[PDB]
Design a protein around this ligand. Structure first.
Ligand SMILES: O=C(O)/C(C[C@@H](O)[C@H](O)[C@H](O)COP(=O)(O)O)=N/O
Ligand SMILES: O=C(O)/C(C[C@@H](O)[C@H](O)[C@H](O)COP(=O)(O)O)=N/O
Lengths: 334, 344, 340, 341
């Protein structure tokens, strides 16, 4: 191992599960939210899953405020929406509160893991479900029990080892379309993750083992745009067709940011209007949306509660956007 | 965990390394081939790296018979070619299917992975001890520790070139690594991968004791692109030119390995010979940037399916279709002739 | 194999350390007690180390009441005694028997060892957090990692003073250690033990991650003998002088700790009061070699057998009750101020 | 941990079991030998168990030559003697000296314990594969995992016969276990240890994977005392009588193994033949409680201090040499024949 510089010890998942066990409150939040998203995916609930929050968590304090503001609207709009905080601990092409909690290249990953599990625990304990991005094959063991929904990143949707992981997660999973607008790799990923798999993974004890999964049927596509936005009713039509042709539920989640916002946080409100019109009009296929939002709109490379990663919408727009979606949902229902 | 049906004990890497230590000659094979490829990547040698052999290993008997034949050509053609055999134990599937010898050596969904690891490492050991270096695809995050000391070159497949955990893996590998262009032909994901892999990373991984740990890598500078086509093949001079400029633009060496198979053959195995003819004219006409090729070859041409029912023919691929030995011998001589012409 | 019926999962030390980390107070209590005991063993403190408490812990409830009472006397008699509570979570049996709180916290042969570990470390942590140092017997080769950071002093049982693995264990322990004389009163075994424990060793052990490893220790100087009688008691100033002679002959400090129980009490808890008088007579009369004493004390004197159990009474060896305990500590604190 | 200087990786047992797997020959040797000692310990065989071999192993080559010679005798005398080779790797020592083959295979204080474990297991494997059963000493709780599958009989250190942890270990051992009498000669501890060891236990151990776990044992019924002397030898008929007596009271089979060396020979290797003569008298006279003997034997008698060393000569305690060993074994066989008819 000439290219390995150092090897340092890592707390087994059991260490963090023992220090920060799920309270009865937290367990209930996870259970109910998973259950509620399953009902939506099976078409037995006309409500809309709303996964919304910062692009990346970098300050537990700002994150807990956001969680309290969001919890309020979650309880206010629960008849129309299943609201889940985005708590993302990040894929790049050149990387998180877990991988470097002190954001200083000290890579205090054990501390990062402690900070992240506590935050997720605290959010779930309040009654707010959480959502995460699963990029690593080892980290999920420390956090998955506090996750009600997760996303496989667009750069890993085609990866066999991430489809294996998805096939064994206890929460539903979204797969993003290709960095070009194509759905095939995401349809393939849903089909793969739906099947059982046998593969090597690290256990709660931190040792490697052979695991066998059952397959995950709570997997769905996420429309994130390509060279052009793909949230319009024309694109929704195409995706639904490609899903029926593949034998999958004609369901989609629409990501209002990234390629779909044209890379302009403000445009997420445009996507919202468009999407609300489709739902208000009777589009039952849109079962969920994803929105990058924070306390303060904008970005930075530190202001309190403002993103250090992608640019997000602020709280006022967030409140607005969330009521629009809840109103679109009543129109589709009554 | 409720979608986790069962958990089973897994031999740690140390137990495989102790049971199957590298011989002196196997370690010499690995060290010499890695150095030789480094020299080609450095432009300090005009030979061509040839990664050639089965799509997937499913039969140690046929693999060793194939290795003997390839070794004889490796020795005959070594002034021109650095021949490394494809010993691929891990297959990425488009959706589902047999994932290779390690995941399921009995090819019947018994998933006897401890046996698969023993079988795989013994075969790699035997092949290297004979003097033939080996190449593999690094797909799984945990299997590399069982095998990497016997690998002279590795590939990251097109479906994982964008994957951060695969780029992290390459930054700590002791062998040179090729990154495939994207399944749609995109070159940029591979240039980014090479740059990512050239840098040090700190990430979670598993040690030779089978325990997760925090690891720090130094970056791997022996990485390069593999052209494997997109919607259309991308082996022709026009494409090699675009890729050279893209690489230089990003501050990387302007050099490529060309996969004759997969989308560059439109998945028609005999078309590898057409790619070969075009690439040999490129090399013989003076193209120095083509430092390597990849070819899917076996003893018997074509392929067969485990789902057919028909008994398995010996020495015939059960994954992608491959050229047979006769075409393989003729292809290798074509490449060696072209490298010689490029030189004179 | 044939005589192994089942194997079950065991939390690694790092899981106990993370859930139940030392508070600053706990870290203080342990640090100072260790320093304090060190100063006594280097003969720079005239005080007496007193290792007193239940024979075994079986009830964090009764154990917590005791710790409050003892802590009061530790703070009052602190100028003469260094009080350290017995918190024994594991017990060596003569043949078989309940092995202590860790091995079987529910005293019913259910061997919920993971709960035992949790229960034991939370208690140890609270006792320390309150300011009361703690002592234990290090019997198991694997449990020490879960508890030793909360131990101010440790003991190697008489039936293991001669054990290589235990002598090795003592040489890497962060706390002072005492070796009980042989069960038949033999003093040599413990002198040898002290000497080994003081040297470095290289041996196999289990790390804080639950993994076996090769360990090198530095050797432990802060080790001493513990007199606990043999075929008859051996606490009398005659025996003490003989021991101080072997210790000198052997090159070691002529220092001793006296256990008023086990063989020195003929297994009769009340005779611990008798031994207290004899040793106080030696200490008031000038004996500067008695650096410590061990006493089996509990809330309610006597002992009971193992369904509902009587509060405050030992399920292992018989102990003196709290009444006798408070007088005993005042007897010792009186003998010390005399020597000074 | 402030008195902990360093921590180094240790190969897990599975790593050595994979590298050096029991052959079929080796497995049968262990199984058959373990079965034959059970029968002897159940009064169902009248043959004598003979654990004999070097005080400790420092040279696998000499050890293999010794094993070859003993194997021949083992076959020649099989109707009378169940001959098991002593394969011990260390001399437990209260003062410093060579730490044995596993601890320090290279005899230079380099503590190449990984090297030692490999050497030690490969030796036990080779010996068992040849057909010769092996006996070992269990001194710690971790090394047995790497070796016990090739052990047909085991002994607990005399300094740890009273230790609960070693009694727990014996309760899970797959081989019969001998327990040594106290150093002053008393048998109470070996009786307590037999009782303790015959009971099921639950305790923490390291597994084949090198991880700690909770284990439960069934208890070991094939345990017995080893007479190794006190202040005075304790092999004579008078002493056997006392021990048979105390065993019958404590509810245990009145049977013993007699260690001819150490205190029973006044630390004089040649006097193992004096003990042999006496024991052979007792046995040929009908004594049936003597189910076994332990002898320290090597190719070349005596010992040497650890530059080239003498081949086949102990570097720990002094042993009888091969000529005395062959004669001792024939003495034992001949007595066994007299006790029966
Ligand atoms: O080995 C290589 O160089 C590869 C991997 C390739 O062999 C893949 O595993 C099958 O083409 C998938 O086959 P399916 O599409 O049937 O899953 N290049 O892509
Ligand atoms: O705690 C101590 O200091 C000890 C241990 C002592 O408490 C022992 O555990 C019981 O006497 C066993 O009792 P039994 O003899 O019933 O197994 N000293 O010997």
């Amino acid at each position: 191992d000439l290219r390995i510089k150092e090897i340092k010890e890592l707390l087994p998942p059991v260490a963090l599960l023992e220090k920060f066990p799920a309270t009865e409150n937290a367990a209930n939040t996870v259970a109910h939210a998973r259950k509620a998203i399953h009902k939506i995916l099976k078409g037995n609930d006309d409500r809309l899953l709303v996964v919304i929050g910062p692009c990346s968590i970098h300050d537990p304090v700002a994150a807990k405020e956001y969680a309290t503001r969001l919890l309020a609207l979650r309880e206010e709009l629960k008849d129309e929406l299943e609201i889940v905080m985005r708590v993302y601990f990040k894929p790049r092409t050149t990387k998180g509160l877990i991988n470097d909690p002190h954001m200083d290249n000290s890579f205090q990953i054990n501390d990062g893991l402690r900070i992240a599990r506590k935050l997720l625990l605290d959010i779930n304990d309040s009654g707010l479900p959480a959502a995460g991005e699963f990029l690593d094959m080892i980290t999920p063991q420390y956090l998955a029990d506090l996750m009600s929904w997760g996303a496989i990143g667009a750069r890993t949707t085609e990866s066999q080892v991430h489809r294996e992981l998805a096939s064994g997660l206890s929460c539903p999973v979204g797969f993003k379309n290709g960095t070009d607008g194509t759905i095939k790799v995401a349809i393939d990923a849903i089909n793969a993750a739906g099947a059982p798999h046998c593969f090597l993974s690290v256990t709660k004890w931190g040792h490697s083992a052979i695991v066998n999964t059952s397959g995950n049927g709570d997997c769905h596509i996420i429309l994130r745009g390509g060279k052009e936005p793909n949230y319009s009713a024309k694109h929704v039509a195409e995706v639904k067709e490609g899903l029926n042709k593949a034998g999958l539920p004609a369901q989609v989640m629409i990501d209002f940011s990234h390629a779909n916002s044209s890379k302009q946080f403000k445009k997420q409100m445009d996507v919202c209007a468009d999407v609300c019109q489709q739902i208000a009009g009777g589009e039952k296929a849109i079962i969920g949306v994803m929105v990058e939002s924070h306390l303060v709109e904008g970005n930075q490379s530190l202001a309190y509660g403002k993103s250090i990663t992608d640019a997000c919408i602020g709280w006022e727009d967030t409140d607005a956007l969330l009521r629009q979606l809840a109103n679109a949902v009543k129109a589709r229902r009554g």
